Amino acid sequence: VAAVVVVGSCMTDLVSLTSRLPKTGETIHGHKFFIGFGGKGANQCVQAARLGAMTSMVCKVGKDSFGNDYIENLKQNDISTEFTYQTKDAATGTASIIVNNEGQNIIVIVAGANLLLNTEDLRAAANVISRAKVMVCQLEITPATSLEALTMARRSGVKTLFNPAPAIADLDPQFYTLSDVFCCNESEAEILTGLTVGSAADAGEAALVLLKRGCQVVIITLGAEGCVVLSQTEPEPKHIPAGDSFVGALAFYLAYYPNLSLEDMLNRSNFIAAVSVQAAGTQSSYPYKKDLPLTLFLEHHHHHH
Template identity: 40%
Template sequence: MQAKIVVVGSLNMDLVVRTPRVPVGGETLAGHSFVTAPGGKGANQAVACARLGAQVTMIGCVGHDAYGEILRSGLESEGIDCSSVEALEGVSTGIASILVDDNGQNCIVIVAGGNGELSSEHLTRYDAAFQAADVIIAQLEVPVATVEKTLTRGHELGKTVLLNPAPAVGPLPAHWYGNVDYLIPNESEASLLTGIQVDSLETAAEAAQALLDAGAKRILLTLGSQGVLYKDAQRQQHFPAQVVQAVDTTAAGDTFVGGFAAALGEGLSLDEAVRLGQQAAALSVTRAGAQPSIPYRRELKS
């Protein structure tokens, strides 16, 4: 069964500079290269869902500009329904300025542009997509009220709701947790959500428990090279990561979310869905870029 997934979130043009290291304040540093690539956590997750087997609808906003046209056409080329991606006058398309160092680590500055204009009214216009979905995915690169409406409506309709709380800036509103079936933070996001510094499996488990205590149903805490920790009220399990040589970690988390959602929505078990997401994410970090790094289902081991 092919999963039907709605992704509500951001579309950015990524402006990527590869550099030996991140410069310190006031320093000018010679970089290795510069490229533009389609990105945004919402769009990345939509592409990951589509490449990893799902039927996907994207809901978002871009500017009425060249970057917006490129982003929409790129998603459409992946078979993603973009009829609910609106091009707005008087605002730029969102961008992400990304520095990637020689160790494959990245730091990112985001300008929201059209992403900041995605409103609850947009969601109401496209409610039919919510009704047809199996899985609904949200992140935090669009307005908080829009995320809340996404979670609430998904829960009302009885859909499987995933929230990737990124970029996290602090604790989530307490009433959100009951509307989320799977909360999927990484280490830094879990630290910001709970106040617990996540730097080991033990502290990851503490943070996951704190999120359960706050009202979350199920936690998938992604730990980079340390794998994924799953925790709910009855079960805790660590899924070790595949060992690979990282080139660029951009969109690895988004690839995991997309792979997990696609697999879960088509009826695979939680364990199978986690492992498929991990396998896709491991392959993505061996390639440069956000969406360009996301693998297709046929590339994964059966």
């Protein structure tokens, strides 16, 4: 029975490497191509599943070979695809990336079938939504669909973890009140608040704005510098001194380790994100439970660390 349900996006990364970037009208011969699995929703789902969560991916891909390939990737990671939809009306989402020998790139994103995931689709998935322990949402599908997913979780008492990524100025105010845990990065927080965010001190001031819009808990991530947290019952910023790995891990802990303090969950999730950064690649770099330190999965009183 899925404890973590993710409503969000799946995207295929298509990468070519070339000596130089092409000029208009030019064909250039590359020396390497590869495919990688992405999308914030998928990536967050995959990290949670690798840690041992029972997860379900609510999303929409194309009735095409990339979408069939995505479905197999979710199944290989032990994720339920019962509400992974396939549509003939758009292609599976893509990120095409060309990179030259100087590390300069060009990137073309087509969100495709992700934008077609709608209310009717979420309604069909009510049983898994209502019965989960945590619902995770981002902003790579139609915002209205994310909203409705958060609204459905709330009506069943399911904990809402929201990642407003990519961010948007003029986000619906309902988003803040529907979010039990609202987690974003520095740049995102600048878009959402129109403040500048450079230090951990600025982050704390930006978090407080978001907290005052109605979020229960706000977390602002600081890259490889940790994160800053506030809550309605503790409004003072606490500084705790890859993004999808962190959010996936936090989902896992919210669903399976409710007896941990926020501070501890965030430590463990920072640790797990840092492991993903060291390993080459993207979703493949996400660590499994068996390859991580066993203290990540024990109560505080059980270990000597």
